[model samples]
Target: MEQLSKSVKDKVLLPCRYNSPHEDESEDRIYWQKHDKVVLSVIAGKLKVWPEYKNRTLYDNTTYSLIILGLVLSDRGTYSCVVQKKETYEVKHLALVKLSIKA
Candidate 1:
């Protein structure tokens, strides 16, 4: 887990890193969350975004990274990324970022 600080109106990149699946292996799914709410997810070869974050969040499938635009005080919270194994349905947390926003 790591801590990050940003001001209102600032854009931030919530870093999430994980090893890509090896050749001949199916890719593991990635999900991003703010608190307990889903921000973005990729499952079964489809990308999905929560309504509130549809336009504000950018997900890079290749790097498994998230970019939050126009950071606001309300957006301050703990964010996490998880990689889910396809066969076992087991989830492994990749990283956690605690975001602090100042008005």
Candidate 2:
């Protein structure tokens, strides 16, 4: 998946990266944490990006891209993009988005 595609709206795009912390966290586990919601995904080697508030899918060029489109007041917070490996299940990438309200 892709986050912050050029075809999308013009706001702010942030990139975050993640990796195996202790090697134990590398086992069919992909976690995307945001605002208190934890996205436990089973798909490995694939990248997933969610919109500001909703679980809206975004276009991810790599494993580190979170794009906020038409950024409004609600899109002002921390957004994360996580990637994990299927075999080791280790975290590959974790991207964050901290948006600021613009006037």
Off by over 4 Å in 1: 20-25
Q: Estimate TM-scores for all models.
A: 0.84, 0.47
User: For residues 1-103, what per-residue lDDT tens digits would candidate 2 score against the true structure?
Assistant: 2333232234555555544443333243445565876433424434443333344434444443444456555554565666656654455566665555644
Candidate lDDT scores, in order, read 0.80, 0.48
How far residue 71's Cα lies from its native spot in candidate 1, in Å, is 0.8
Deviation from native of the Cα of residue 89 in model 1, angstroms:
1.1
- Candidate topping TM-score: 1
Count clashes in each candidate, considering only residues at least 3 apart in sequence or on different chains.
0, 14
What local lDDT does model 1 show for residue 85?
70
| Per-residue C-alpha lDDT of model 1 across residues 1-103, encoded as one tens digit per residue | 7888999988888878666444112566778988769998887657889999988988876667788999989998898888877665876547888999998
Question: Per-residue lDDT for 80 in model 1?
Answer: 88
Assess candidate 1 and give its lDDT.
0.80
